[PDB]
Amino acid sequence: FPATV
Amino acid sequence: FPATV
Amino acid sequence: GAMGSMERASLIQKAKLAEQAERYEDMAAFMKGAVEKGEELSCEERNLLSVAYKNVVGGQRAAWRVLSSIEQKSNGPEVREYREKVETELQGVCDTVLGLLDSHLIGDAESRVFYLKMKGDYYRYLAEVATGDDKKRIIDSARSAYQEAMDISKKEMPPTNPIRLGLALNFSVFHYEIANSPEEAISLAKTTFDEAMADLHTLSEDSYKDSTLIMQLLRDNLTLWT
Amino acid sequence: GAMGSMERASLIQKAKLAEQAERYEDMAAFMKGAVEKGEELSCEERNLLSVAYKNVVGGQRAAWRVLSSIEQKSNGPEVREYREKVETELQGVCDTVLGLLDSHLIGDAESRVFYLKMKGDYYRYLAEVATGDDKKRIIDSARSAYQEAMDISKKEMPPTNPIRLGLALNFSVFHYEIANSPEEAISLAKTTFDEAMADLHTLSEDSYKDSTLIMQLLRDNLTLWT
Numbered sequence: 001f002p003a004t005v
Numbered sequence: 006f007p008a009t010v
Numbered sequence: 011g012a013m014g015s016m017e018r019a020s021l022i023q024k025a026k027l028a029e030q031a032e033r034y035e036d037m038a039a040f041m042k043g044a045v046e047k048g049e050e051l052s053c054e055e056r057n058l059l060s061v062a063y064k065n066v067v068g069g070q071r072a073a074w075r076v077l078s079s080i081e082q083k084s085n086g087p088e089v090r091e092y093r094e095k096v097e098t099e100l101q102g103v104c105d106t107v108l109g110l111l112d113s114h115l116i117g118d119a120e121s122r123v124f125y126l127k128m129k130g131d132y133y134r135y136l137a138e139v140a141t142g143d144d145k146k147r148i149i150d151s152a153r154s155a156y157q158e159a160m161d162i163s164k165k166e167m168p169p170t171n172p173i174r175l176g177l178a179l180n181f182s183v184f185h186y187e188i189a190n191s192p193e194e195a196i197s198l199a200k201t202t203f204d205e206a207m208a209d210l211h212t213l214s215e216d217s218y219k220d221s222t223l224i225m226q227l228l229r230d231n232l233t234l235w236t
Numbered sequence: 237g238a239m240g241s242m243e244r245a246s247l248i249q250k251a252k253l254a255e256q257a258e259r260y261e262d263m264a265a266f267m268k269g270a271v272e273k274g275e276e277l278s279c280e281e282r283n284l285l286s287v288a289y290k291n292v293v294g295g296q297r298a299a300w301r302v303l304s305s306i307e308q309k310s311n312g313p314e315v316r317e318y319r320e321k322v323e324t325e326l327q328g329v330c331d332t333v334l335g336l337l338d339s340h341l342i343g344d345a346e347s348r349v350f351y352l353k354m355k356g357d358y359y360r361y362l363a364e365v366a367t368g369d370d371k372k373r374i375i376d377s378a379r380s381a382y383q384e385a386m387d388i389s390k391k392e393m394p395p396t397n398p399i400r401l402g403l404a405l406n407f408s409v410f411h412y413e414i415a416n417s418p419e420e421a422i423s424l425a426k427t428t429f430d431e432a433m434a435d436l437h438t439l440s441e442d443s444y445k446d447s448t449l450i451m452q453l454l455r456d457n458l459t460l461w462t
């Protein structure tokens with residue numbers, strides 16, 4: 001899954 | 006630490 | 011409130027005690043109480059709040075996804091019922107935060123971007139589980155919150171700034187996984203990484219390690235999308 | 237109770253859904269409700285219960301220890317207060333289980349050893365945080381529960397049996413870390429491992445993998461103690 005912060 | 010189950 | 015008798019400073023301490031014990035529910039509760047003492051939060055304090063609630067919703071999102079994929083494959087009502095129970099619980103935590111933003115938190119530029127990015131993130135988390143009439147009301151909100159934060163960051167922070175960078179990463183992910191707009195999602199991420207390296211001389215000693223990481227994460231996402 | 241309207245079988249399903257989502261509080265609650273339907277638990281069902289509550293108390297014990305060592309090093313009252321809050325929470329979960337054992341669970345030999353071992357374990361967990369008059373009442377209890385379970389297992393199960401083996405491992409740890417009796421602690425563990433390999437021909441296809449592991453854990457502890 002794509003990275004978020 | 007010692008192992009327990 | 012249950013934290014209402016405690017001193018703000020003792021609440022900050024215990025939030026930090028909770029983070030060490032990895033008790034993020036407690037951590038979030040402590041920080042919700044500190045916010046409710048009505049004072050501005052410091053940069054260190056903003057990030058105690060964000061880390062605590064992010065760890066909370068993160069476990070819920072992960073449990074929701076486990077159950078939801080079971081519920082997909084399975085199509086007894088017990089799977090639906092348990093999924094809905096974890097869902098309702100997750101929705102409440104997002105409301106608690108969006109309420110905490112829209113009542114005490116939403117100053118200086120980094121401070122305003124920080125909270126507007128949180129608003130867009132937790133609207134996005136609700137979007138992940140919403141459906142129907144009520145749903146699309148949620149998507150537009152995540153988008154306004156993000157856009158406003160983009161506008162501010164683009165004008166007031168250098169393109170190497172961690173808040174500007176991390177916000178854009180998430181706004182990209184929003185385009186991809188939430189608005190079926192891989193075009194915008196990829197454009198933002200590439201532009202963001204590009205503009206940051208164009209002005210790479212603007213990194214500061216205090217945050218350069220963080221900026222390098224968010225740039226690496228922007229290219230991680232880009233590798234994954236192409 | 238909150239699970240009182242649900243079917244036992246739907247409670248078992250959701251306990252299993254919760255384990256997959258790693259939602260062990262939910263898991264424990266579901267299994268507490270199933271127990272309270274008043275029927276015997278199957279072997280599979282016993283271990284859904286044990287795994288759920290063990291994961292619950294395990295996180296609490298770990299948080300307690302983080303805070304307690306901070307509290308030791310530190311010798312403001314906030315550390316004591318947060319430690320006591322996590323402590324009280326942990327004590328409640330042990331009471332909930334000890335109550336669940338002393339009211340519905342405490343049949344066949346493996347079944348009786350299983351629950352008596354749980355009784356000794358959760359008395360031991362309370363012993364880890366107790367002090368004073370109230371304290372030593374707790375140590376003797378963990379010991380009776382264990383002893384009775386030892387007596388049964390020694391007579392009714394072969395020395396390769398996982399329940400007999402795992403119980404003895406924990407009873408050893410109890411001697412070491414709770415009764416300041418390294419002598420007995422080491423004796424039990426060595427004897428247990430020895431007697432099991434003496435009659436190694438008694439492993440069964442259904443559980444041999446488990447027995448090998450508890451034997452490896454018995455020797456892991458022994459390496460650590462000498």
Ligand SMILES: O=C(C1=C(O)C(=O)N(c2ccc(O)c(C(=O)O)c2)[C@@H]1c1ccc2c(c1)COC2=O)c1ccccc1
Nearest residue numbers: 005053056057120124172173175176177217220223224
């Ligand atoms: O934990 C991290 C950091 C610290 O806790 C911290 O204080 N940061 C930081 C640095 C400069 C700042 O100006 C501020 C601020 O104004 O509040 C915060 C990192 C960080 C925190 C949150 C976000 C980002 C960066 C980007 O978007 C975000 O939401 C972290 C670092 C890299 C990647 C992900 C997380």
Ligand SMILES: O=C(C1=C(O)C(=O)N(c2ccc(O)c(C(=O)O)c2)[C@@H]1c1ccc2c(c1)COC2=O)c1ccccc1
Nearest residue numbers: 010279282283346350398399401402403443446449450
């Ligand atoms: O998860 C494990 C297992 C399963 O869940 C399971 O069903 N087992 C099992 C095998 C034979 C049995 O007769 C029974 C029973 O009568 O209830 C249960 C393993 C197991 C569970 C709990 C304990 C032990 C063994 C020893 O003491 C214990 O408390 C596990 C395996 C190895 C080490 C630690 C844990």
Ligand SMILES: [Mg+2]
Nearest residue numbers: 057058060061
């Ligand atoms: Mg942080």
Ligand SMILES: [Mg+2]
Nearest residue numbers: 283284286287
């Ligand atoms: Mg198990």
